[PDB]
Amino acid sequence: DTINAKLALTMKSGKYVLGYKSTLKTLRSGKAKLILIAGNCPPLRKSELEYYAMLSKANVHHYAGTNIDLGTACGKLFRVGVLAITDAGDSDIL
RNA sequence: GAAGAGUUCUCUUUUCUUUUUAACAAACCAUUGAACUACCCUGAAAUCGGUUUAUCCGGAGCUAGGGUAUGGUGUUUGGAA
Numbered sequence: 756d757t758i759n760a761k762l763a764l765t766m767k768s769g770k771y772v773l774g775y776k777s778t779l780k781t782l783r784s785g786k787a788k789l790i791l792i793a794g795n796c797p798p799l800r801k802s803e804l805e806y807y808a809m810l811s812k813a814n815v816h817h818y819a820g821t822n823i824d825l826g827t828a829c830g831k832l833f834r835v836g837v838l839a840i841t842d843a844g845d846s847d848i849l
Numbered sequence: 850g851a852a853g854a855g856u857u858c859u860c861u862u863u864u865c866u867u868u869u870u871a872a873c874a875a876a877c878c879a880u881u882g883a884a885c886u887a888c889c890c891u892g893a894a895a896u897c898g899g900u901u902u903a904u905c906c907g908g909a910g911c912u913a914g915g916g917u918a919u920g921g922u923g924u925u926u927g928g929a930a
Contacts, residue, residue: 774908777893797909832895836909
């Protein structure tokens, strides 16, 4: 299966936050299990998000597709630069 | 409104003139006129919203709420009656 389907599954039944500021909050709290980073993300931000994840022992997936594709992949009609998944629910993302 | 003047068969509570306030200094300031202009904080937006005369803006963080800065040929005064 593709990550888009897993992302579509985990948003039907699951927990998530969208965007940079909310992602940092879940990484700080320790409830972020997996963060998805858009392919065209700012290069400095990617280093910061990767560092936050390593400190909180969360997985990072730099998956191909821009913030436009990531926004579409979550079913939203706006660009998404980074996702944080606190709960897969019924999906097999983790 | 006031002071003076012009006209006045008749009419005209009339017509005309004067009724000013500098550099500089201080405190405020989007109030009273011009800002959500830029930035920050909270928060996280699809039933998408905000918004200009001019359609641009937002998960790279909208709307909203509260702040910070920019400051006079503005205000209140000193100067200055």
